Write a protein that binds this DNA or RNA. Structure first.
Length: 147
RNA sequence: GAAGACGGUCGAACUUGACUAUCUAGAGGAAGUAAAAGUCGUAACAAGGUUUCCGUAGGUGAACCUGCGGAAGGAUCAUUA
């Protein structure tokens, strides 16, 4: 299987396409993990560091997240099988990088970590601005600027 | 001595701009209370495993942590030339 990057658009010819995201449920009750297997390839296909899309699930779900250089596992704590992610797999696009003028997420970020500001720019119609101040992930991005 | 006309004086109503009082519709946003077999933790109650609480300021998935100055409603009404 393969998919469009976002399912709010039903078009077969939509500009954005990527591999599936698949995960393992591991352990037993009071200590369950969900580990995301494709995360480095999905982060490469979306042109972002793999910390940002992993951190967004913990911000929405109300859950802990882990990262590890010794084992390369990316983890969201608790059981999040099937619909518990797959109803909202669009979200890292749908709550950040859709343009309000047109539904075309051909979109870039630049971080000014010395001055508490994240700049945003979409190629599709020239839409520019910043990320939202009520939204969760802004406090993580300013402490973790892009490569 | 009839119709009619100039001038005053009451003043309904009409046009135009502004102010204002009630009721009423709405993209989208952000909160509160019912219900008690959803999810991730374990902040408070026994020294609750870092005593707790107040004012103010900064910081984070969340409960919350840290700096400065107070309170006991404390876990001491007491410590010896």
């Amino acid at each position: 299987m393969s998919v469009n990057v976002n399912r709010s658009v039903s078009d077969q010819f939509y500009r954005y396409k990527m591999p599936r995201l698949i995960a393992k449920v591991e352990g037993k009750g009071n200590g369950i993990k969900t580990v995301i297997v494709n995360m480095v390839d999905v982060a490469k296909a979306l042109n972002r560091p793999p910390t940002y899309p992993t951190k967004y699930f913990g911000c929405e779900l109300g859950a802990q997240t882990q990262f590890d250089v010794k084992n390369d596992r990316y983890i969201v704590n608790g059981s999040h099988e099937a619909n518990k992610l797959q109803d909202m797999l669009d979200g890292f696009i749908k709550k950040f990088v859709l343009c309000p003028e047109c539904e075309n997420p051909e979109t870039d970020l630049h971080v000014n970590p010395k001055k508490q500001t994240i700049g945003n720019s979409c190629k599709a119609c020239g839409y520019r601005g910043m990320l939202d101040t009520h939204h969760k992930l802004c406090t993580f991005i300013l402490k973790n600027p892009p490569e």
